[PDB]
């Protein structure tokens, strides 16, 4: 019907990938063996969107785990929800790219591309009618950023009707690991401004700042942020899986959000995040829930909307919940503010609602934001590409495999096309 | 910050101008009805006719 074939890339993907199928499978009542032990018959009617049925009534996900050091596949297979995949799908190389885009794009990665498309094209032909794909990855390294730009532009080559959606961790400079994160990130958008056209923006700096104020956590391990990431990639395709009082699938959210075809970088955020000490005293109604979607600290991308102006807003709700409190509450926020929300878009809110909440909650929601303040995240990573590239600090690590000095400049103003296009609409 | 404070004071003055005009229009409409009814009554003139 409306299926999606999942794909991963790199270490930063598989930790979000293996946390994803710990969440989707627990929403469908599926054991790590794969056989169904649920409670409602409604949990299995649209299980064919992500999964596939083997013999014996066992279900296999439609996912391919891609990396370039075989220690990463041993990390995920040995995990709790990790033996579920068909073992003919862990496609990897052996000689690591090693935070080198030019390896993962030109020389090392392209040795493996003819293999990885076969497991892509066999799980997509098993489908009857495609809707799209998924890539979970980052934009800091070279094993997953540069293969990720390979693996999209050679998958638009084949299935360019069906709408593809990637989910990208964009690297902040305030909490950074490697030195050359400008050199991989500011040019990897050259094939993500064009080829996916559905891409989300998650910052590791803002993912910490959720975890100090709202959650108020002491020790945030990397297994709890991917909890927070995989519970909002799930929410944007719950209408596509579960029945809705007013629903909107994946393609419907594209045609109503993006005003012009190169502005598709989003601002996700989960609604009812609350701490374990202040959980009981907190009210759970709908005007309380819109108190928390439109914050500046419950936003997973490290850019502040009040330094910009909103283009459009979606908010996919969940639960058994009324419909005047959806609609009249979000007219209210649009009316009382009226300055961030633009003119010449006379309604700046889209909405939707399912019937089934996430497991263990009375009601939740998922906020999607499309803001014009995201151009300060592109400004603050290209200025750090002015500094290192004037005196040519690190270009020899990637140019032993062949890129002249202007292919970085060609994809500089191709990225700096995108800064000004938010400016002209503000 | 200082220019936004200037516009806040501007819109407060505009608000009090419209509030004064609401008061004057309410008094005018009530006094117009009061002076308009005073000869005769309503619909009993029709029944008597």
């Amino acid at each position: 019907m409306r299926e999606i074939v999942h794909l991963q890339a790199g270490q930063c993907g598989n930790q979000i990938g293996a946390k994803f199928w710990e969440v989707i499978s627990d929403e469908h009542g599926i054991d790590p063996t794969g056989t169904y032990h649920g409670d409602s018959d409604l949990q299995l009617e649209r299980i064919n969107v992500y999964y596939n049925e083997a013999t014996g009534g066992k279900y296999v996900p439609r996912a391919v785990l891609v990396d370039l050091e075989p220690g990463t596949m041993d990390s995920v297979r040995s995990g709790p929800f990790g033996q579920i995949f068909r073992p003919d799908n862990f496609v990897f190389g052996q000689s690591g790219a090693g935070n080198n885009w030019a390896k993962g794009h030109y020389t090392e990665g392209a040795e493996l591309v003819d293999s990885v498309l076969d497991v892509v094209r066999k799980e997509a032909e098993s489908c009857d009618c495609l809707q799209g794909f998924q890539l979970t990855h980052s934009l800091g390294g070279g094993t997953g950023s540069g293969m990720g730009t390979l693996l999209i532009s050679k998958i638009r080559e084949e299935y360019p009707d069906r709408i593809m959606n990637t989910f990208s961790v964009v690297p902040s400079p305030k909490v950074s690991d490697t030195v050359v994160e400008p050199y991989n990130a500011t040019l990897s958008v050259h094939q993500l401004v064009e080829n996916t056209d559905e891409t989300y923006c998650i910052d590791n700096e803002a993912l910490y700042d959720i975890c100090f104020r709202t959650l108020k956590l002491t020790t945030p391990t990397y297994g709890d942020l991917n909890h927070l990431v995989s519970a909002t990639m799930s929410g944007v395709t719950t209408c596509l899986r579960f029945p809705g009082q007013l629903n909107a699938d994946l393609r419907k959210l594209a045609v109503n959000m993006v005003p012009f075809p190169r502005l598709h970088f989003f601002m996700p955020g989960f609604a009812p995040l609350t701490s374990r000490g202040s959980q009981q005293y907190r009210a759970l109604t709908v005007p309380e829930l819109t108190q928390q979607m439109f914050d500046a600290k419950n936003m997973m991308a490290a850019c502040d909307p009040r330094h910009g102006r909103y283009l459009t807003v979606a908010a996919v709700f969940r639960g058994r919940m009324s419909m005047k409190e959806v609609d009249e509450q979000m007219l209210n926020v649009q009316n009382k503010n009226s300055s961030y929300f633009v003119e010449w878009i006379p309604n700046n809110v889209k909405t939707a609602v399912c019937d089934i909440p996430p497991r263990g909650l009375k009601m939740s929601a998922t906020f999607i934001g499309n803001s014009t303040a995201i151009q300060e995240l592109f400004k603050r990573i290209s200025e750090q590409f002015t500094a290192m590239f004037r005196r040519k600090a690190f270009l020899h690590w990637y140019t032993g495999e062949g890129m002249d000095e202007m292919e970085f400049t060609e994809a500089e103003s191709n990225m700096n096309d995108l800064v000004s296009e938010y400016q002209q609409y503000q | 910050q200082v220019r936004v404070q200037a516009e806040v004071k501007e819109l407060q003055a505009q608000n009090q101008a419209l509030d004064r005009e609401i008061q004057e229009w309410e008094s005018r409409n009530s006094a117009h009805s009061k002076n308009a009814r005073s000869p005769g009554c309503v619909q009993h003139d029709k029944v008597k006719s």
Binding site: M1, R251, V255, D327, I345 | -
Partner: protein, 427 residues
Amino acid sequence: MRECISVHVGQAGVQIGNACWELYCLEHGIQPDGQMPSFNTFFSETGAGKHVPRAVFVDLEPTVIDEVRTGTYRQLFHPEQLITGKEDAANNYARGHYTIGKELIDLVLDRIRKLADQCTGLQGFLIFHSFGGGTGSGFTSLLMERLSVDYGKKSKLEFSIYPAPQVSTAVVEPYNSILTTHTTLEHSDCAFMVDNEAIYDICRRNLDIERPTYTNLNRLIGQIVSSITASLRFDGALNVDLTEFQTNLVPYPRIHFPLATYAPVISAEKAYHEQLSVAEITNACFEPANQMVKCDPRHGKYMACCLLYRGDVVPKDVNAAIATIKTKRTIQFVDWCPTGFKVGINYQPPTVVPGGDLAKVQRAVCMLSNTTAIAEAWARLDHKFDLMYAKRAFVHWYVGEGMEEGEFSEAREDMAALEKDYEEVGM
């Protein structure tokens, strides 16, 4: 033999049709799985003792049809009638018009053919839809155009949810609403409309109900449709055939968009204390609150007014209260309509749904107004479209899926002609 064929298209269509067909099935003595432990206006009969509705359900997203196909009405319909696409229209007039609906328009028209050959005295179709979505604009436009050029001069009535001023869920809703109004301006006999924001206000105010869902609206729309079509099933003092609205309400062939309301919308805890006589309910129809479409009533003058009374009603009460309404000279009727009204009466009182909220009232009125007031809604629905189309927002998807840039413009002018036509027939 006053048979009508009902097609529900759009999610608004099928979710209204759920409440409509539970209301019609409880109207007669039909138990809901089909059997029975006058009904030939909407139901065919098979000699095992089974009743089959004259209904075709269609959407291009399978889950909203499949919940009907699995739920408690699975044995009501011949299960080929629940038509279902593969890929959703994705809120896209071009996709539901030019690209996606070309796989399913043939199936729905052939099942319409088989039902109209099952029928024998055919009178009209009831097409249930909205002005919000791709399959609620484009597929309905193709359906109406093909049924007009195929069946002839038979009454294709359409029922429309209307886009409110400050209430919408989409962003691009002026675009597809002005497009479906342009291309369905010609081949629908009449188009009733309702406003969700006004039903929200009535649900807050008259019925004492806070936070209403969509079932609490679709029950009211079911009561409206049943009060329209009680005349064909049950006979009364002054019956009104369904063709009579075409020569009655609309004066010029672009003005076929009348409004409606239904006056004793009242909960049990207040209707236990209040009596509701005929003069009371027909005076109560004309409040600016108790209408069902948001237009300011007092800024417009009335053209015609078709009242439908249901239950115990004596005709002199009607004929006195009508002149009582007329003589006030603030309810401005146009100076080229001295007749004013058109009234019908049926004997069988309004019924009650299980799990319901409208109180059982002995008599009820549904009034069909034709006002001049809706020029403000057409002014604002042209204005929002004009605000977005100054700099080409959201257009490139629809132009990649099948219209050039000029067809939005010619629909803009072919809709603005209607707003000039109201000032023409107003002055």
